[PDB]
Every structure is written in C-alpha cells, then in structure tokens.
Design a protein that fits this description.
One of its GO terms (biological process) is entrainment of circadian clock by photoperiod. By secondary structure, this protein is mainly α. The protein has a five-stranded parallel sheet with strand order 3-2-1-4-5, with helices on both faces. The protein binds flavin-adenine dinucleotide (FAD) and chloride ion (CL). Flavin-adenine dinucleotide binds next to helix 9, helix 11, helix 14 and helix 16.
Length: 486
C-alpha cells in the first residue's frame, strides 16, 4: 500500500503545494507532519514571530480537519523522530518542499540517508521560489548573477515561472487510527505560553494560509494600484494602511505561494499595458527575493563578513554602548526610535523605514557592524529571511551590491518629507504625543517651556541625541572612502 508523510518546514499552505499532491496521490494514509523542537528557546527568537508560526500551524490544522485529515506536530529532532515513525506507520514515500538554506541542506541530506535505509521514496519539488535556482546558475554559464539587471535579463530569457499547482482534493487520506506517535495529546498545536514565553505577542498581523489569501485579494482589489506599483515612491510613515502589501511574513513561512503571486500580477499586467517595470514594480520586488535567494545559495559564508567572497571587508567598530541605544529605541532621534519601536511591537516596518535604521547604525552614524544589526532583526522581524536579511543588510552597509556610501540618510529630514506632523512618531512614541510638530523631529531644539507644556523634557522623559549627525556622518563617510580605496 502507500502510506505517505508530507513534511512541513516552509510551505505552510495547501494551495500550490506540489509535494502535498504527490503525497496524497494513490495514498491509503497521509501523515501531515511538522517537526517542532521543544527546546528551541533554550539555545534569539521573539514571541511575535514564534506565535506567527503557531497561528500559521492552527490554520493548516483547521484546513486538514475540514478535509478529513489532521495535522501532526511532532516533538524532537527530525533525525531522531523520522526513523521511528517510518516503521511505525509503514511509510513508502516522503515529500517535503526543497530548501536552499545552509542548515536545511545539512538536515535534508541526513533525512535522505535515513529514508534510504527505511526504503522510503524522497520527493522534493521546488515551489518556495519562482524558478529552479540551480537552473538559473546553469543557464547563466555556471555562475550566479551579481546585478539585478543581469538577473532580470536571465529570467526573461528563461520565460514564465511554473504555474501554481492545483488545489488538493477535498477529501484527504486520513492517518491510520490507534498510532502511538500520532496521539492528539502529543501532536497538538501548542500555544505561546506552553512553549515557554512570558510576554504576549503585540503584532497586528495574524499568520495562516487563510490570512495570506485574504490579504492577497485585498491588494488586488485595485488593479490600478497593482500595475503602477513603484517601490521607492511608497510612504514609510503610513501605519494605519501600509503603503505596501506586507506579504513578506507569509512568503517567508510559505503561507503564500510566490508563483501564485506572480501569476496574479500577470493577469493585471495583461490588462494594464503601462504597468510598472522591474525592479520598482511589484513583480520586481518578487524578483529581488528570487535574486538574493540565487546568489546567497551559491555563495559561501553569505550571512557573515569574513570568508564572504562578495562582501567588502570593513573594520566595523565594536561599540556595545551605541548598539544598546539603537536596539532599545533610545538614540534621541524620534524618527529612528519610532521605527525600532515598531520593530519590537509589530515585527514589520516599511522597506524605507528599515533603510533609515540600518544606515544610521552602520555606514551612516554609529559605524557598528551590519552583522550586529542583523541579529537584532533576526529575532524581532516576523518576515525574517536568512538570504534576504543578509543581502539587504550588506546593501545598507555598502558592503555588497550597493556601493554609494556618499548617500547618507538624514535621521531628521527623511521622515519629515512624508510626515511633517509626526503621526508615525506619536503612535509608537506616545511620550511626544503633545510635542508641537515644529520640534517633534528635533526635541532637543524645543525651548524648555515648550518641553514642559508638551509633557516631554529631553533628558528626563526623552533621551538626548547620542550623536551629532553632521559630525558622525562626516566621519563615517571619510572612513568608507579610505576602505573603498582597497
Ligand atoms: C536591512 C533590511 C533587512 C531586510 N530583511 C528582510 C527580511 O528578513 N525578510 C524580508 O522578507 N525582507 C527583508 N527586507 C526587504 C524589505 O524591507 C521587505 O521585504 C519589505 O519591507 C516587505 O514589505 P512588503 O511585503 O509589503 O513588500 P512589497 O513591497 O509589497 O514586496 C512584495 C514582496 O517582495 C519581496 N521583497 C520586497 N522587497 C524586497 C527586497 N528589498 N529584497 C527582497 N525581497 C523583497 C518580499 O517577499 C515582499 O513580501 C529587508 C530590507 C532591509 C533594508
Ligand atoms: Cl534624507
């Protein structure tokens, strides 16, 4: 007979899940399995992203229960758990989505060795990305592109990505009854309290396939806004209705298929001929995700500076005092501090909002290593992607891809061009909710009578700026000019 296991790691979805379709095909019993390490916290990971994962698991549970099946959340390590449940369930086929991360390449190779000793067929289709990222490197001549423009000409030379896979059947083969490793009490979806978290999640984005599909349709409600999407022109101070899709947390965990997103964009572009072109287009943003995934998978030490053949070697400063002030939203700059507050509260910021805080920490003012700022973003970002966090932090640090260090964002005037009233700052920094808009970006420039009337006195209620931008910026630019002379 056929008893199949569909292993979920990314790909927390049912639409366009080619590995799920192979598992359910001709199967007598299907075992949807998610491997959960109960000692992860005893290793880093905030409760916002982790509950986003748990909420995303509850969506598959309701989806599997609606189709006559059931999601099995197994505890332990895949290498210890899979050899047991193989012979316990009589497994003949194991399917899971292909992953190109460094840890995943070591982990899947081990499970491939374990399934071969148990006589289990391993099937790993690609759907997390748009294309076969190995086929991109082969058709390019054996090397990955290092520019978006060279990368854009490659995927256009290949053609359209594969269409999204059809929906799975409405009735799935259930797991076999009376199995010890599939007990409901041991395979239930845990809560954030039970996994060992004290504080509740404060984010506003609910995880799951249902939420990803609903947010997708809401974005395509206005095809005019979809076709004319230009990324650098979006508003980073828009928090009530963000100026972008905010689909990154769902694309990270796999709740939303990238090929589903791409084929929906083509439906709009075919009717809107003056639509935006890459890289500023909405497709182009998906191509950024496809571009960084291709280079990082073929580049050694991509999440680090040393040993990285594409990262410029820069003698970043070790200043724990600036790092503590930047990660704790106490830099004295309300524009930077409000964004770092939105990071720990929502887990998501606008792309240009991440630009201001990343530039300020590195090549802009504090000259702290981009690696240290990436660790802070790995923990709180609900859309944390290993290849994407890394390449975008080397961009903002002028270490790779980007090399125009002379462009330094002003932590005072950047947010003023979009929000002169400071509506963004007053929401996340309520200590300045009464400060007049004339001094809300520069609280140290307000007279002491205005500071008391507004209820916010610099130094007692709000910290003074840790640096003078004109002095700090002038020092960081000169150092990067001497380093880029290497
Ligand atoms: C320092 C820094 C760190 C970042 N870390 C991450 C990260 O860990 N995870 C992450 O998903 N993105 C990361 N980004 C990219 C970008 O900031 C986010 O993808 C974007 O804010 C997500 O909003 P959205 O979903 O509304 O994007 P949209 O503009 O609506 O774009 C749609 C999708 O395209 C992709 N995309 C958009 N911009 C980029 C980009 N610059 N690079 C790669 N893919 C992109 C995402 O999957 C996104 O969901 C980072 C950028 C910076 C500057
Ligand atoms: Cl600016």
């Amino acid at each position: 007979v056929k008893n199949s296991i569909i292993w979920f790691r990314k790909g927390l979805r049912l639409h366009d899940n080619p590995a799920l379709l192979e598992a359910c095909k001709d199967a007598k019993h299907v075992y949807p399995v998610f491997v959960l390490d109960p000692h992860f916290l005893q290793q880093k990971v905030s409760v916002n992203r982790y509950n986003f994962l748990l909420e995303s698991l509850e969506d598959l549970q309701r989806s599997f229960q609606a189709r006559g099946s059931r999601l099995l959340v197994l505890r332990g390590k895949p290498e210890e758990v899979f050899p047991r449940v193989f012979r316990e369930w009589g497994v003949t086929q194991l399917c899971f989505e292909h992953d190109t991360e460094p840890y995943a390449k070591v982990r899947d190779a081990a499970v491939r060795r374990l399934a071969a000793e148990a006589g289990v067929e391993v099937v790993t289709p690609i759907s997390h990305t748009l294309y076969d990222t190995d086929m991109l490197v082969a058709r390019n001549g054996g090397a990955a592109p290092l520019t978006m423009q060279s990368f854009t000409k490659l995927v256009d030379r290949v053609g359209d990505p594969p269409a999204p896979a059809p929906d799975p059947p409405a009735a799935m083969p259930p797991p076999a009854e009376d199995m010890p490793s599939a007990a409901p009490a041991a395979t239930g979806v845990p809560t954030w309290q039970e996994v060992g978290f004290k504080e509740p999640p404060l984010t506003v984005f609910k995880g799951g396939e249902t939420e990803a599909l609903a947010r997708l349709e809401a974005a395509f409600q206005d095809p005019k806004w979809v076709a004319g999407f230009q990324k650098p022109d979006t508003d980073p101070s828009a928090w009530e209705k963000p100026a972008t899709t905010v689909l990154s947390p769902y694309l990270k965990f796999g709740c939303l298929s990238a090929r589903l997103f791409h084929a929906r964009l083509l439906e709009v572009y075919r009717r809107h001929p003056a639509h935006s072109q890459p890289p500023v287009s909405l497709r182009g943003q998906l191509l950024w995700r496809e571009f960084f995934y291709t280079v990082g998978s073929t580049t050694p030490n991509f999440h680090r500076m040393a040993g990285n053949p594409v990262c410029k070697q820069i003698d970043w400063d070790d200043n724990p005092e600036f790092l503590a002030a930047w990660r704790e939203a106490r830099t004295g700059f309300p524009w930077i501090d409000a964004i770092m507050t939105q990071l720990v509260t929502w887990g998501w910021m606008h792309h240009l909002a991440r630009h201001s805080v990343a530039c300020f920490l590195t090549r802009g003012d504090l000259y702290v290593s981009w690696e240290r700022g990436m660790e802070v973003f790995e923990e709180h970002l609900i859309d944390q992607d290993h290849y994407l966090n890394a390449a975008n932090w080397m961009w903002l640090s002028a270490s790779a891809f980007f090399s125009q260090y002379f462009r330094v964002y002003s932590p005072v005037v950047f947010g003023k061009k979009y929000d002169p009233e400071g509506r963004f700052i007053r929401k996340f920094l309520p200590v300045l909710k009464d400060m007049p808009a004339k001094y809300i970006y520069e609280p140290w420039t307000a007279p002491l009578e205005v500071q008391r009337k507004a209820g916010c006195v610099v130094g007692r209620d709000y910290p003074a700026p840790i640096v003078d931008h004109a002095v700090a910026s002038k020092a960081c630019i000169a150092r990067m000019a001497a380093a880029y002379r290497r």
